[PDB]
Amino acid sequence: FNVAHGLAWSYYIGYLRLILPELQARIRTYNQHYNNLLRGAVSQRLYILLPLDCGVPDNLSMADPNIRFLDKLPQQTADRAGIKDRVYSNSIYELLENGQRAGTCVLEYATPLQTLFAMSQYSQAGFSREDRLEQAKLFCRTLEDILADAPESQNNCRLIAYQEPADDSSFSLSQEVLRHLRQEEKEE
Amino acid sequence: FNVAHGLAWSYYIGYLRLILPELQARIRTYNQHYNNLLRGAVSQRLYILLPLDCGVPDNLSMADPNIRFLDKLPQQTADRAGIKDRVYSNSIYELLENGQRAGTCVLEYATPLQTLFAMSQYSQAGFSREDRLEQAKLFCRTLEDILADAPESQNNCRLIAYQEPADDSSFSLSQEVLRHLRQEEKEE
Ligand SMILES: Nc1nc2c(ncn2[C@@H]2O[C@@H]3COP(=O)(O)O[C@H]4[C@@H](O)[C@H](n5cnc6c(=O)[nH]c(N)nc65)O[C@@H]4COP(=O)(O)O[C@H]3[C@H]2O)c(=O)[nH]1
Ligand SMILES: [Mg+2]
Ligand SMILES: [Mg+2]
């Protein structure tokens, strides 16, 4: 089956569509209340790590020690049937560079990529572990094309797609994330 | 595209697989702390409303006035990358019969059916509004076949699939839900 397509659409409809519009105000609140001082500096976008290899560790610090958990973005509450006042969780990380706090932003993996990885295990899934990669590529794809026409995506988030070279492991996830942050500084 | 399949699998992998094992203990706690007084009576299963017509209202009371929100099942917390301590929300409803509290259980719609309904709107979704029904049927389907081999589903939840007659509107959702409760009471 072609799943990447459906998961991208479920992802947007049940999450991005809902949270992105109310996202920036939530960021602003954290900044005002927590400091309105010192670093503040929480970036204004939702950052979605897109590991093409579909490897998604539950603790972000594990993938890279330089990615440190700061706080949790103030809850969002919504009556998502049948649930009442259903909580939506985002986590705030600060990226370290040579022991220096280089940036602070709302950051997270794309769960759909993780589910994709898990699905290949199951017999009835039924898409081979081989198809994990193309499925991964189709996902980031569909999202871009979805977010392109997203009235909500008034540049509220930035996708971060990456694959780590097979031969060498000199890849720094924090570095990848920092690039986008800095670039958007020159951009913004 | 065939989406019902992927959404059923995402649903189980990212939700049911995770919460069902820890579900009953959460139920016991509400019963124990809140009581052990008066009704208690929270049922021991997760109830998933499966409207084949794919109509999923955000407020459960609206669908049926006799379905009343009681409280919220104690939070579950899990490090769901990239999120840390990601909250999982379930709501407890008590069903009314002729002004009488007939039952109390954890109850909710299947969000995937709601997303299915929303997808048909979009141009790129790729699937006609016509296909909403077969997509709905394939979803409840896949879930049953998924939950059948679910090591986790040690009878922790019961699916409730239903479609409302086209000619007449004498259908009581609370009645449908009560049936399953009583019938399982026969399980005792
Ligand atoms: N950081 C973050 N990301 C979020 C949140 N909610 C949704 N997402 C993203 O939205 C995807 C699909 O959301 P879904 O439509 O709600 O559909 C969900 C929903 O139907 C069910 N589900 C998941 N979590 C909960 C929950 O906490 N409570 C209830 N009642 N159902 C849930 O699992 C389906 C798929 O779950 P997912 O695999 O998790 O995948 C979720 C997840 O990738 C959130 O609160 N925080
Ligand atoms: Mg949702
Ligand atoms: Mg999940």
Taking the centre of ligand 1 as the mean of its atom positions, its distance from the CA of residue A44, in whole angstroms, is: 23
Neighbours of A58 (CB within 10 A): 16
Contacts of A167 (CB under 8 A, 6+ apart): none
Are A14 and B111 within 8 A, CB to CB? Answer: yes
The two three-digit tokens of residue A177, written as one number:
């994330």
Nearest to B80 among A13, A111, A112 (CB): A111
Tell me the chain B residues in contact with residue A57 when contact means C-beta distances shorter than 8 Å: 81
A165 CA: distance to closest CA in chain B (Å): 22
CATH fold, domain A43-188, is Rossmann fold (3.40.50)
The 3-state secondary structure of chain A, one letter per residue: CCCHHHHHHHHHHHHHHHHHHHHHHHHHHHHHHHCCCCCCCEEEEEEEEEECCCCCCCCHHHHCCCEEEEEEEEEEEECCCCCCCEEEEEEEEEEEECCEEEEEEEEEECHHHHHHHHHCCCCCCCCCHHHHHHHHHHHHHHHHHHHHCCCCCCCCEEEEEECCCCCCCCCCHHHHHHHHHHHHHHHC
Experimental technique = X-ray
| Cβ contact A173:A41 at 8 Å | no
Resolution given for this structure, in angstroms: 3.0
The domain B1-42: what is its CATH number? 1.20.5.5200
Domain B1-42 and domain B43-188 have a common topology: no
Structural domain boundaries of chain A? 1-42, 43-188
Q: Which of B173, B172, B181, B186 is nearest to B41 (CA)?
A: B181
Q: Which of A45, A125, A60, A121 is nearest to A96 (CA)?
A: A60
State how far the Cα of B120 lies from the Cα of B130, in Å rounded to an integer: 8
Tell me the chain A residues in contact with residue B58 when contact means C-beta distances shorter than 8 Å: 78-81
- Ligand with smallest separation from the Cα of B108: 1
Atom of ligand 1 nearest to the CA of B80: 1
Q: Which of A36, A66, A61 is nearest to A178 (CA)?
A: A66
